[PDB]
Nucleic acid binder design. Structure first.
Ligand SMILES: Nc1nc2c(ncn2[C@@H]2O[C@@H]3COP(=O)(O)O[C@H]4[C@@H](O)[C@H](n5cnc6c(=O)[nH]c(N)nc65)O[C@@H]4COP(=O)(O)O[C@H]3[C@H]2O)c(=O)[nH]1
Ligand SMILES: [Mg+2]
Ligand SMILES: [Mg+2]
Length: 87
RNA sequence: GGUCACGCACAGAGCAAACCAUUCGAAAGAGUGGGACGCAAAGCCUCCGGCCUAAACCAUUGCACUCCGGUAGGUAGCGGGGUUACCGAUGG
């Protein structure tokens, strides 16, 4: 199951794009290093976030410590990603 | 002369990008005043394509690194099309 990139789900769609990036950046970067965050609010991409880490154990600790967290008054559904980012 | 096209002018007009001020707006963007980048319809209309915004209503639990919900607003100075018009190259 474990992977590098973090896939966040069930996020608040009312939140603007830029702020969501910044809100997730500040919250998560206490676990490890971050290269980029990808978020869009297209029909297919709503309530979703992608975090580009370097190591697994940071991302694992990011996942296992806050799964179900009421971020912006909504539970965070946190599970791993599948494909390596094209960067 | 009319009409339909056309723009190498002539002649009298017209409009106003950017920026600034101010109002409206959630925003894109619009109004107004100053100001001219340009414009042969840069007059007027969103019917079609594009592009831009997304606050609200409805829809949506979605795995991306092309871009993609409905709806609503916007752009006519992004094209298409509709509609109106000044001048007239011994002009076609
Ligand atoms: N009366 C009349 N004359 C015409 C017309 N078409 C062409 N001309 C003549 O041809 C010149 C160059 O035309 P342009 O390439 O459209 O280049 C023009 C045009 O792009 C622009 N312009 C000026 N006035 C207007 C206007 O009322 N509407 C538009 N759309 N553009 C204008 O400025 C340029 C220079 O303007 P001008 O000093 O008048 O110089 C004009 C004008 O003398 C027309 O339909 N009516
Ligand atoms: Mg003149
Ligand atoms: Mg003409």
């Amino acid at each position: 199951r474990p992977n590098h990139t973090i896939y966040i789900n069930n996020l608040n769609e009312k939140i603007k794009k830029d702020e969501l990036k910044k809100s997730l950046h500040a919250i998560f970067s206490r676990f490890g290093q971050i290269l980029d965050i990808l978020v869009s609010r297209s029909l297919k991409m709503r309530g979703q976030a992608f975090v580009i880490f370097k190591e697994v154990s940071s991302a694992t600790n990011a996942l296992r410590s806050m799964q179900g967290f009421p971020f912006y008054d909504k539970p965070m559904r946190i599970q791993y990603a599948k494909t390596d980012s094209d960067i």
